[PDB]
Design an enzyme around this catalytic site. Structure first.
Site, PDB file in Angstrom:
ATOM      1  CG  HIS B  26      -9.166 -10.688   8.715  1.00 48.51           C
ATOM      2  ND1 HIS B  26      -9.313 -11.844   7.974  1.00 48.51           N
ATOM      3  CD2 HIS B  26      -8.179 -10.939   9.608  1.00 48.51           C
ATOM      4  CE1 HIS B  26      -8.446 -12.746   8.397  1.00 48.51           C
ATOM      5  NE2 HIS B  26      -7.745 -12.223   9.385  1.00 48.51           N
ATOM      6  CD  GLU B  69     -11.076 -14.418   8.927  1.00 43.51           C
ATOM      7  OE1 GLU B  69     -11.220 -13.827   7.830  1.00 43.51           O
ATOM      8  OE2 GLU B  69     -10.249 -15.343   9.097  1.00 43.51           O
ATOM      9  CD  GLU B 145     -13.657 -19.550   6.898  1.00 42.57           C
ATOM     10  OE1 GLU B 145     -14.319 -18.501   7.046  1.00 42.57           O
ATOM     11  OE2 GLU B 145     -12.450 -19.555   6.587  1.00 42.57           O
ATOM     12  CG  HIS B 148      -7.730 -22.921   2.470  1.00 41.78           C
ATOM     13  ND1 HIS B 148      -6.803 -22.567   1.516  1.00 41.78           N
ATOM     14  CD2 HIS B 148      -8.514 -21.833   2.656  1.00 41.78           C
ATOM     15  CE1 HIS B 148      -7.014 -21.318   1.141  1.00 41.78           C
ATOM     16  NE2 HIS B 148      -8.050 -20.851   1.812  1.00 41.78           N
ATOM     17  CG  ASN B 205      -1.807  -8.342  -5.870  1.00 43.66           C
ATOM     18  OD1 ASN B 205      -1.559  -9.546  -5.877  1.00 43.66           O
ATOM     19  ND2 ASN B 205      -1.030  -7.446  -6.466  1.00 43.66           N
ATOM     20  CG  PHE B 209      -4.817 -16.446  -0.059  1.00 40.37           C
ATOM     21  CD1 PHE B 209      -4.246 -17.683   0.232  1.00 40.37           C
ATOM     22  CD2 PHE B 209      -5.593 -15.822   0.915  1.00 40.37           C
ATOM     23  CE1 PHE B 209      -4.455 -18.298   1.469  1.00 40.37           C
ATOM     24  CE2 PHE B 209      -5.810 -16.428   2.160  1.00 40.37           C
ATOM     25  CZ  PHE B 209      -5.241 -17.669   2.435  1.00 40.37           C
TER      26      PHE B 209
HETATM   27 NA    NA Z   1      -8.968 -16.800   0.153  1.00 38.82          NA
END
Ligand code: NA
Ligand code: NA
Ligand code: NA
Ligand code: NA
EC number: 3.2.1.23
Lengths: 211, 211
Positions: B26, B69, B145, B148, B205, B209
């Site tokens: 990614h 990704e 996906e 979310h 960081n 998330f």
């Molecule tokens: Na995440």
């Protein structure tokens, strides 16, 4: 087929034309009773072939139509192939028998809604967005009739146009329709008024449905 | 690839499994910098081939995935074909490079919306209903996906399910995701609390998330 001057004016002013054979057997039960009957192939063939022979040189004509509301019969497949063979320059369309039969190059439903399915037995009218992506389906969709403009109408017209613009294979449609079929009658003083079905003693009739 | 027991439990309890190669790049710029580079083909190949060799006998595995990704590179196309050749019993999917590349049997976008287009350059996320019927497109669509589920979320979940049920070729998707990646820490009193990004002096960081 229209009065011949119509095509001249469409050539010169610039309008795309669907030229349609004079074949409608709506009142038959079932709708394809005559169009699936080889006895009626000769009569149908002349309404298709003689239209093509007359109008094939007009640039405004871009699509041939096999007629209207006559179900889907073997006679349609025969005549579909005849046109494809004699004039490869123009797609052939026909709505009868569910709008996506083997007798049409274009998915051409009438009054299929934008988002709402109408799952009628044998001849469903799918949501136009849904119709495009049915398994195996690859053809363009152009409604032969939509947004029925009877009286105070055209509610939801914007919903069609948003869909047409978003979906490449939704390539528009033909509103039903241009002009009220009202007729002039006169009162005792000679003053004209607009008349519809039943106003001429005609019976049975479908009243204001001509407008 | 998961811990070997997972597939045994999915076999016996009954869950469909997408088995996915341990390949995600990614953070590269562009995303396919390593996956389009033949010097990285050997390392990628082993993450795909050794997964297939291990898991090919599990009935729960119904789909192979080439990773996540890592853009779309020539290495994906090579490894897509390798799987197709060695194991014709399972479709191969991969989302990278726009979710409908030549390296996937299934249109498998992430977070493509139901009705709303997101026309990003090179890698658009079309409305899922629209995606199915793009000119020449015939594949099924299953979101790798969607929805979310971060914190107070899953607003609009019903909209996906209405679309899935209405459209034959919209065959569902995989919610992101199952379980918060929070970690237990202990306060001065020895009482446990849930920690996320940055709570271990880790920097840079991405905070909450991970949940
Ligand atoms: Na995440
Ligand atoms: Na369009
Ligand atoms: Na009418
Ligand atoms: Na579906």
């Amino acid at each position: 087929p229209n009065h011949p001057l119509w095509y001249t004016l469409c050539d010169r002013y610039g309008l795309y034309v669907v030229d349609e054979a004079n074949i409608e057997t709506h009142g038959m039960v079932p709708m394809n009773r005559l169009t699936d009957d080889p006895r009626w192939l000769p009569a149908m063939s002349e309404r298709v072939t003689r239209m093509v022979q007359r109008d094939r040189n007009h640039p405004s004509v871009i699509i041939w139509s096999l007629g209207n509301e006559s179900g889907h019969g073997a006679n349609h497949d025969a005549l579909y192939r005849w046109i494809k063979s004699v004039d490869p320059s123009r797609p052939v369309q026909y709505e009868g028998g569910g709008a996506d039969t083997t007798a049409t190059d274009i998915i051409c439903p009438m009054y299929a809604r934008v988002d709402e399915d109408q799952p009628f037995p044998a001849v469903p009218k799918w949501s136009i967005k849904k119709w495009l992506s049915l398994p195996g389906e690859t053809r363009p969709l152009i409604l032969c009739e939509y947004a029925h403009a009877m009286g105070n109408s055209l509610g939801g017209f914007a919903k069609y146009w948003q869909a047409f613009r978003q979906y490449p294979r939704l390539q528009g449609g033909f509103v039903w329709d241009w002009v009220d079929q009202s007729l002039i009658k006169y009162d005792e003083n000679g003053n004209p008024w607009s008349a519809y079905g039943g106003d001429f003693g005609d019976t049975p009739n479908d009243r204001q449905f001509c407008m």
